């Protein structure tokens, strides 16, 4: 998940009244990946590999 | 050559009639 | 009434915006 | 490793630049559109959606168009005439795209058109993508 | 935050266990026929 | 599937940090706290020109 | 409840009817076709695949056509000259859409376009999704 924005909540208000008002949204998104693969192959003769 | 797969988005299959034997006919 | 929702583009930046970097101070 | 998504996820098109194009909703049980802008805009453009039914002639060909209704949500007032309307912003450049859906589901069939028909209009591309299917 | 307004990704079905087919398997004429077993590839009578 | 009211609550408290830093740098004491740059107590030094 | 799905998988035009747009597959990791019908067919439409590179003069616009290859799957043979292809067939009917892919990526952008350009092509639509982004 990627945290696009932060919303903006709330703010300073006098202590004499009894409501509060609404902020506005942020943002939240998603995101994927994939993985690549290596690849390769070799050779060899057994005689010369064990009497080595 | 890429094998597409089908399918349709109706839901109307053919309202096939049926027939029933005639009234008894003779040879 | 509908929200939309843009990216800011396909390419991060599909022409870089680079810049000048700031004029050094004076001697 | 890629997939076949379009067996999950089909795509139809729905406003090419000079016409609307009807798309049937009804196997489906989400949907959402997709703007795409092909060149600078000059004004911004307004569109609306519609909704259809199906008619009596035929059971499975849209009737007329019935504009699809506002739904306020739990924050923020209903529209000045309570219908859904979208704008595409002066802003948006040639190299990205848009995406907004309706909350609400109505009749079968929907569709998009431009509010007027002019040459900035022609600049606009909308697509509608389906989520998985019922049957 | 709601639907219509977030993606899809944050929403995961639940999974269900039944298994629906459609297809059948039509009966066999094969416990009519004469029943012989042979244990090699050709026989005589 | 994601915690949208902890999200919610982080983001109000970080809302609330931000703001109470501007506070105490530059705020008015008529609603926020008085800043000590916006009080102007501090003694001051100018710079002096130059004939260019 | 409805999703949105555009936000996640959005979907590009490809072949509208009369011309060919290139998708930049660049800025995702899967994809796939769609083809729709919106009148009766006479003979099997063939659609070629290809890929474009990035401009030498300008790195923000795709270069020339290049055709896709074919990868021969695990168990099947090449086709006739190695090359990617598709043909619609003839019993398609019009209430039907039709899914395919190609196995490997190659370059960053991708384009479709008939092998002829006659009556018959004109009838056919094709749009690409995209799967979950990556930015």
Same mark, same amino acid.
């Given at each position: 998940?990627?945290?696009?924005?932060?919303?903006?909540?709330?703010?300073?208000?006098?202590?004499?009244?009894?409501?509060?008002?609404?902020?506005?949204?942020?943002?939240?998104?998603?995101?994927?990946?994939?993985?690549?693969?290596?690849?390769?192959?070799?050779?060899?003769?057994?005689?010369?590999?064990?009497?080595? | 050559?890429?094998?597409?797969?089908?399918?349709?988005?109706?839901?109307?299959?053919?309202?096939?009639?049926?027939?029933?034997?005639?009234?008894?006919?003779?040879? | 009434?509908?929200?939309?929702?843009?990216?800011?583009?396909?390419?991060?930046?599909?022409?870089?915006?680079?810049?000048?970097?700031?004029?050094?101070?004076?001697? | 490793?890629?997939?076949?998504?379009?067996?999950?996820?089909?795509?139809?098109?729905?406003?090419?630049?000079?016409?609307?194009?009807?798309?049937?909703?009804?196997?489906?049980?989400?949907?959402?559109?997709?703007?795409?802008?092909?060149?600078?805009?000059?004004?911004?453009?307004?569109?609306?959606?519609?909704?259809?039914?199906?008619?009596?002639?035929?059971?499975?060909?849209?009737?007329?168009?019935?504009?699809?209704?506002?739904?306020?949500?739990?924050?923020?007032?209903?529209?000045?005439?309570?219908?859904?309307?979208?704008?595409?912003?002066?802003?948006?450049?040639?190299?990205?795209?848009?995406?907004?859906?309706?909350?609400?589901?109505?009749?079968?069939?929907?569709?998009?058109?431009?509010?007027?028909?002019?040459?900035?209009?022609?600049?606009?591309?909308?697509?509608?993508?389906?989520?998985?299917?019922?049957? | 935050?709601?639907?219509?307004? &977030?993606?899809? =990704?944050?929403?995961?079905?639940?999974?269900?266990?039944? !298994? %629906?087919?459609?297809? &059948?398997?039509? =009966?066999?004429?094969?416990?009519?026929?004469?029943?012989? !077993? %042979?244990?090699?590839?050709?026989?005589?009578? | 599937?994601?915690?949208?009211?902890?999200?919610?609550?982080?983001?109000?408290?970080?809302?609330?940090?931000?703001?109470?830093?501007?506070?105490?740098?530059?705020?008015?004491?008529?609603?926020?706290?008085?800043?000590?740059?916006?009080?102007?107590?501090?003694?001051?030094?100018?710079?002096?020109?130059?004939?260019?």
């Amino acid at each position: 998940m990627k945290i696009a924005d932060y919303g903006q909540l709330g703010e300073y208000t006098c202590d004499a009244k009894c409501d509060a008002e609404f902020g506005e949204p942020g943002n939240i998104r998603h995101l994927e990946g994939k993985t690549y693969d290596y690849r390769g192959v070799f050779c060899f003769n057994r005689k010369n590999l064990q009497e080595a | 050559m890429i094998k597409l797969n089908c399918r349709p988005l109706c839901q109307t299959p053919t309202a096939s009639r049926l027939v029933s034997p005639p009234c008894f006919i003779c040879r | 009434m509908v929200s939309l929702d843009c990216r800011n583009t396909c390419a991060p930046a599909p022409a870089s915006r680079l810049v000048q970097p700031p004029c050094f101070v004076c001697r | 490793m890629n997939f076949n998504v379009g067996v999950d996820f089909p795509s139809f098109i729905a406003w090419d630049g000079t016409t609307s194009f009807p798309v049937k909703i009804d196997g489906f049980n989400q949907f959402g559109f997709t703007f795409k802008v092909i060149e600078e805009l000059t004004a911004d453009v307004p569109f609306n959606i519609f909704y259809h039914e199906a008619s009596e002639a035929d059971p499975c060909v849209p009737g007329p168009a019935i504009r699809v209704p506002d739904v306020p949500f739990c924050d923020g007032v209903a529209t000045a005439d309570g219908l859904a309307t979208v704008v595409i912003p002066e802003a948006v450049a040639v190299d990205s795209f848009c995406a907004g859906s309706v909350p609400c589901f109505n009749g079968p069939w929907i569709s998009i058109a431009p509010v007027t028909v002019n040459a900035d209009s022609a600049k606009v591309q909308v697509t509608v993508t389906m989520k998985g299917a019922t049957r | 935050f709601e639907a219509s307004t &977030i993606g899809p =990704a944050f929403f995961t079905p639940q999974v269900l266990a039944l !298994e %629906v087919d459609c297809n &059948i398997e039509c =009966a066999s004429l094969l416990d009519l026929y004469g029943q012989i !077993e %042979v244990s090699r590839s050709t026989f005589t009578y | 599937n994601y915690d949208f009211l902890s999200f919610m609550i982080g983001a109000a408290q970080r809302s609330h940090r931000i703001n109470r830093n501007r506070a105490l740098m530059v705020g008015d004491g008529i609603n926020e706290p008085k800043g000590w740059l916006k009080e102007d107590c501090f003694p001051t030094f100018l710079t002096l020109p130059v004939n260019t």
